[PDB]
Design a protein around this ligand. Structure first.
Ligand SMILES: Nc1nc2ccc(Br)cc2s1
Ligand SMILES: Nc1nc2ccc(Br)cc2s1
Length: 126
């Protein structure tokens, strides 16, 4: 079902939360070799999440589930805010700009925490 597909997508999202927190600890500790690997693991996770979310939105549209489509349009837009912040963070790491890396890291945390009440609302709507 689209609802079980969203639960799968939500788990992939939680996996990225877990890896992100590990990556934050590694960054604070200066373990740049770990950070590089965690960033790659986050890129693949977000890429997958982005796809599951698109398939769910397209399916809700085909089903005519107007409320779920509204929420998923708002959610995917917020997801892209997070994706842009993540990508700038990766660039800051490549550039050795720890000040920018820190800024992007906190911003991605805030963008993410805000989008949580909507994440739950989508589960109920599908
Ligand atoms: N294609 C995408 N890459 C990312 C990276 C981080 C976050 Br948050 C969302 C996305 S969507
Ligand atoms: N529960 C939630 N998971 C996510 C993932 C990415 C972004 Br951006 C916001 C949220 S809110």
């Amino acid at each position: 079902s689209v609802k079980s597909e969203y639960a799968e997508a939500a788990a992939v999202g939680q996996e990225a939360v877990a890896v992100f927190n590990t990556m934050k600890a590694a960054f604070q500790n200066g373990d740049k070799e770990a950070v590089a690997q965690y960033l790659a693991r986050l890129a693949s996770l977000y890429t997958r999440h982005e796809e599951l979310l698109n398939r769910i939105l397209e399916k809700a549209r085909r089903e005519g589930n107007k409320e779920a489509v509204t929420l998923m349009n708002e959610f995917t837009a917020t997801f892209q805010t997070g994706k842009s912040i993540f990508n700038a963070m990766v660039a800051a790491f490549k550039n050795g700009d720890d000040d920018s890396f820190e800024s992007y890291l906190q911003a991605l945390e805030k963008v993410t925490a805000k989008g949580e009440t909507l994440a739950d609302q989508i589960a109920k709507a599908l």
